[model samples]
Every structure is written in C-alpha cells, then in structure tokens.
Target chain A: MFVKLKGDLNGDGVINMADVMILAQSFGKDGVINSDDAIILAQYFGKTK
Target chain B: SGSVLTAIDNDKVAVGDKVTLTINVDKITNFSGYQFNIKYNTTYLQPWDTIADEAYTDSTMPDYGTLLQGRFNATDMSKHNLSQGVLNFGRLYMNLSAYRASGKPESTGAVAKVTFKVIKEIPAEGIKLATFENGSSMNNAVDGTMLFDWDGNMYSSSAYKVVQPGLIYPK
Candidate 1:
C-alpha cells in the first residue's frame, strides 16, 4: 500500500498552494490553518510522493 | 520525555451533548508529532456524527486540538471504528526549516483535542488513551503507534507516560 504523504490535502500525491487553498477554505476543521500551516508545508513545497 | 495529560472539559455529559477531551504533554522535548488510540466504551461515546457516519478524510477529519505545530495530519479516521471503540489519528511536523531555526519543537502543552458525543449513559471509568490492541487494524496503521520526536523517532515508554483521566460521568 502506498503511504499517504502528509500535507497532500488534494490527495494528488503532492503538497502545493492548491492544498493550501483547501486548507484556507475549510480553515479550522483541523484547527486554524494560518501561515503556520503554510510555512510548515512550505518546507516541502512542491514535494510529490 | 515526560507525561501526556488528558482531561475532559465536562465529565457528566447528557445524551446528545458533546464533550471535549484535551490531551496535553508535559516535560517533553522536541515534541514534533503524535499518534495514539482514544479508546472508549462504544456504548457510551463515538466521534461526533457527521455526514451519515461515513469515514473521515483530511477534509472531514475531527478536531486535532491546538497545541502541536505543523499541518501534516497523518490521521486515518476511516479506522475510527465505533464497534472497536477506538479512534486512530496522528500528525507529523515536517517544517524542517522551522525546526532548524528553533533547534527543536514544542516541549509540552495540549497536543490533541477530540470531541465525542454522549450517545447514552456512561459509567464512571469509560475512556482512556490506551495503547492500540495488538494485531488490530489500528495497530496495523502506518503511524498509529504513539508520540514522536522532531526526528520522527518513537518515544519509549521511559521517555513519556500517558496521564489520562477516566470518562467519569456523574452518578
């Protein structure tokens, strides 16, 4: 089974602004999604698995 | 290494009412992420009913509290089976840049918060942050074991202890 990459909100095997937009839309179902969420995902921006 | 503290905002919950379970870590170092089982009596409580009891995804995941940093939620709420009376979820801090800048992650505080609905009357001791059942489906998940360090190493029991409270409903 393929391991789901963290921060890949779109389930597209990648973390990008799209995922961040998804985060921004829903906001805080998983707690407030602010710059912290973006900055955290930024470290591995464009990372695909 | 330290302790994981758990508390219920309201122990005596009426049927149809919700209660928040707060999980805190104390005396821990580089507390990057965590995974564990919030085992409870199914007859008493399960996660909040949303979207016709369907499985939860990242888009429909439960509240993970507000303590740990980062947004890498590795939780599989589909495994949060009510029959088994266990909730499986975890998150990892992948902010290498932040970790590098700070040299470490948070040491302690409320790392997770789960809200459960009181479907029926609960007994005195009904919930706990227990280890997953051996060989169970949750136990087989990718990261449903326990807490982790900034480097993603599983913390030994010696490094931390779970300080949890029983879901004690009023008599």
Candidate 2:
C-alpha cells in the first residue's frame, strides 16, 4: 500500500491534523512510524483545507 | 561478549492501578542497543508503554540511534517461535556513526522504563515476569532471532538474568 506524507496519513484525499495524530500515536512502534513521518504531516499543516 | 540481563523496580502490582518499573542491564561490552521481550501474564497484563534508557537515546547521547519496534504478531501466535505478551526491543542501528567507541556505554544502570496498566486481578504474592531464556519460546522473530551479536555469535539471557519478583498485584 502507498504510504501517506504529512497530514494526509490516512490519505483521505486531504490533510487533517488527525493524520498527524495518527502518526503521533504510532511513535513507539519500530520502523512503522517515526519523527520523519511526523515532520511530513506538520509540513502539510496549512497546505490542507 | 560479556553478559546482558534485565530488571524491574517493582514486582507486585494491583489491578486498576498504573504501575511503572525501570528495566536495567549490566556487564555490557561494546554495547550499542538491544531488542528483546518484556514478560508478563497475558491474562493479567497486556497493554503497556516503554521508554528507552536515557543514556542510550539518540538525542541524549548525541548520536543517531534507533529504538525497539515489532509488536508480537498478535494475529498468529502458534506459528512463530516467540510467545504472546512480548515487547520486542531491537538493537540500535550502528554501522559507525552511532556506534559507541569500545568503552563508553553505560555498563550498569537503567536501560528502559515501563508504564503498565494492570488489566487483570492477580495474587498479592505476585506472579513472575519472564526473562530471555535459551529457546524459540521467547526468542526468534520476523526480523530474525535477537541474541546473536553483530559478529554472528550468540549470547545466553537466562544465564545472567533473573525473572522473578517483577510481579503485579491486586491489592
């Protein structure tokens, strides 16, 4: 499956802070989610809407 | 090539109460990182949050290091060599940059901390928490077995470890 970048973690066609939250929730996971993943979501902060 | 093991601050735990324990290690040689399972009764405890030992953290140590991952393939337990209720701790990525030069890693002290919400009621005497024993029952993972060193040798966890008194209670 294609991974989402930034706030579109869900890839629901747009960016939502929720996407960032999802990434945040997965922090402790090993290789699954990480700081780079969060930054991508944050970079899309205002771009989505 | 020396010895490695784990420890917890408290063994006795009560249901409904959140318990936190620090995991420790010692006698490390050229220590870089680690990956292994944290033992607990699946019937009594399951969900937990663990933080890596500060001394080994990337930011804290001024190096680029990775931490543990890989949840216990919950969907299929019987097929894998490892048992259920395991928190896999993998060794950090160290080729050269993150690798600590032959003598500065913390050889003795807290390696990680765990915050667990006791879900099931248990005896006041407390049940035993497991340590890495020599077998597929607690070792072996999708990424590969965890006891082998970077040099392709093996280490034994049960020999230098203790797994009792890391208990939970319902009092």
Candidate 3:
C-alpha cells in the first residue's frame, strides 16, 4: 500500500514538511505550482534532500 | 535565446537613407517581458550620439517607435536613418534579456553590430586646389605640402588651391 501526503508539495522522491512550507509561502505568487515553479521547487528541494 | 542582425548601406549613405537593425528570439516560454541596451561605434567615428545611449524593452511585438524592434518566437526587424544628414561613420551595440522557463530571468541572446560611412556630394564652388613653390629653395616644399599630381617631369602640390573665389567655405 502507498500513502501520499499533500504537504509533499515538492516530489523530491521524499515526503517532508519543508515542501509544504514552501508551498504555503508561495501560495499567492504567480506560477507557484506551474512548470517553471515546479522545476525551481524541485531544484531547491533536491539540493536540500 | 535571442539574436540580433545589423545591416548598413554599402554605398555612401545619405541623410534619410534607412539603417536597419533587427532582433529576434528563437524560443519564448514561461516569461512575461524583457529589456535591453544597445551601443555602437565605428572605425572613423564614434557611435551616433543621439541613439546609442539608451535602454529598451518590449512586452509586445510590432513596437513601431523603437529603431530596433523586439520579437518573440518570430523574426523582428527595426531601422534608423539620418534624419538630419549622412553620418561619417557607424557602429552598433546590443544587450538582451529573456525570461527563463523557471520564471526567473536571464541574459541569453546574441548582439549584432556594423559600421558604415556616409558619402556627400562636394559642391563645385567648394572644391579647392592649391600650389606652393618652395620659397626657401624653390625645390617644391614637401614639408607641410602634399603632392597631388606628378607628370614624371613636374609635380604639383596636393594641398588645396582655390578653384572658385568665395568669402566663406561651403558648410
């Protein structure tokens, strides 16, 4: 069985609260979850992970 | 990325002849706007003073006011001409900006530059021819004088001599 967390906003092959924090922080900004935003999120997340 | 192309007339350019410069972006994605700067120079003269020192941007294509047009995912062209008179020299400069796919911005582009000379018609009365005989030795002064014509038997000073009597030189 697999369990998914919505807080894992950045799917960096991991489930962490930091991803949630980022999404929370960027919720109002433009393209917060779009391709460009996702790529940037992934890059930063990958580095931290 | 973006690229710029510059073109100039080979013949002596005159005031009012169009000088065209073009800028193009190969791929545009995930971006909203961009800005740029352009500079120019020439072999015989400095860059045109009026148009060389300014920053430009384009949020939309078909910017008719700019001498250089900015285009995205399309070929863009712009032009400038001597509104007053032909210039003696030419040069170009370009600075480019683009929005990255990451929604960030980057300077990814090429700059094209060129220089050209302007030709002017010399008025008949404005033409001057001069001759000097060496007062010191009568050997034909070569110090401050230039040899304009030589027939192998005799030489004439290359310096200007009055072809037409006028009070003031042609402007």
User: Local error of candidate 2 at B154, Å?
Assistant: 5.2
Scoring each candidate complex against the real one, what DockQ results?
0.05, 0.03, 0.01
Model 2 chain B worst lDDT window (10 residues)? B72-81
Write candidate 3's Cα lDDT for B60-160 as tens digits: 11222232233311122222212311111111111112212223432222223322221233233432111111222112233211111111111222322
Best by DockQ: 1
- Give the Å shift of residue B21 in candidate 3: 1.3
Per-model TM-score (chain A alone): 0.69, 0.54, 0.32
Docking quality level of the chain pair in candidate 1? incorrect
Better of 2 and 3 by TM-score: 2
lDDT of 1 by residue, B98-170 (tens): 4435654677787666667777776556544233332242332232345555544455557766665564563
TM-score of 3: 0.21
Residue-level lDDT of model 2, residues B68-163, one tens digit each, is 122211010011122355443333322212222223333454545545566788766767654443223222332222332222223344434433
True contacts kept of 1: 0.00
The stretch of ten residues in a row with the least summed lDDT in candidate 1 chain B is B134-143
Chain B TM-score of model 3, please? 0.23
Arranged by lDDT with the best first, the candidates are: 1, 2, 3
Off by over 4 Å in 3: A1-49, B1-12, B42-171
